[PDB]
Symmetry: C2
Subunit: 137 residues, 2 copies
Amino acid sequence: MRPIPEGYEAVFETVVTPEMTVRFEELGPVHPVYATYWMVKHMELAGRKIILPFLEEGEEGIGSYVEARHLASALPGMRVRVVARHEKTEGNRVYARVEAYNELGDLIGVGRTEQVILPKAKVEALFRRLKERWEAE
Amino acid sequence: MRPIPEGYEAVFETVVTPEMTVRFEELGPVHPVYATYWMVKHMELAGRKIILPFLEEGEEGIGSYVEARHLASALPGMRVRVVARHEKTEGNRVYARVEAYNELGDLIGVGRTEQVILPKAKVEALFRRLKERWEAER
């Protein structure tokens, strides 16, 4: 992977849909606002946009870690902007800091993600081996 | 809220479905395995099951923090079990540790969550204030 510039920024913009509110299996609807786990999905997405421009032939990125602190809320129908910035790269691991804002400009979340860069063949091999073990059962 | 016993555990079990694999807006399908954000959703779910039995009338819990390290994979069709454990409660903040396993028993993820306990009226007021501010733009 080519070296990612320090502070390289990638963004993901969306609008909170009804399907993005806090709703769990078993428990059902909980809160009529943008869910933390949806924010996490979008933070991972913004983080992935940081590495795509730099991936070399046969390389792939896989999510390895995520953390997010939910500071404020975003209501259904509101625009949401997620901004990921390259913090550093250690070996084959890319670190990014992320921030999310709602339509009114409120900071609704802060987080960090880690992505591991591996040959697509290696990734396929890992999933392949897991499948074999499962079949062996 | 009634005091939660130290080490109190709650579990959530499910089967990985195709809808739970790594797939993003704009980018599309990425990896055919249980997604980290889906694991996070389920860790939040297990964590909430910890406070529900202790919430007193009028109280509510809201997710405040989530953290997860994805160690191994879970394939579609595999059973997954998420275990949340009450670590401690400070003020109105409940701290829980979480660990997840796939059908083969592999540790697929470890993390932590934080939930804030507040009166349902307070929660509704917070969402209401936000909506009033949004309306104020028009």
